[PDB]
Symmetry: C2
Subunit: 101 residues, 2 copies
Amino acid sequence: SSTPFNRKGWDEWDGHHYSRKYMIDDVMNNHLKTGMTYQEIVDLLGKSHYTNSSSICSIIYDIDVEYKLGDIDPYKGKDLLIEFGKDSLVISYKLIEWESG
Amino acid sequence: SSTPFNRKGWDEWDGHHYSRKYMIDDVMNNHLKTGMTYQEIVDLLGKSHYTNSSSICSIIYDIDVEYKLGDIDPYKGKDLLIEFGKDSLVISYKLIEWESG
């Protein structure tokens, strides 16, 4: 199932952001462009899950997370990686699939 | 190949931290324990690649990164995820394998 991005659904949270997996395709195809500013990204998607701040700037939005029944922690998921270059402009963005254990 | 952790090798950098993949097993088996403080982790491993700061605190060390010949960006890698709970104590740590595209 694939649905258009909306910010309410993007923001919905219960343990994880459980509606983002439905709109990631629209986000990447139809909303993300190289050349957007950091501020534009934050305006669109809100605050990221990870950052490399604290000279490429890099942020990560959780997209999907999957659990085994009875496990506190998840064994796989999907992330959205957005990288910024000069003038705080988007230089790349990609979907990351990860697994643990 | 698997070698003991040393901090010089852990720190070595050329594009990525290219010696960490050899010592990650020793790090997880023999140096990481739940209950260590945030400060102890930073003393051992230095500064992480990602953080969720900027109430679980979460940090990520790049362990390994792989590239296709002629590609600016990598298509897969390995990360070390360390999660902190109360009193800034380690509550879990795991190896993350990721891929893109």
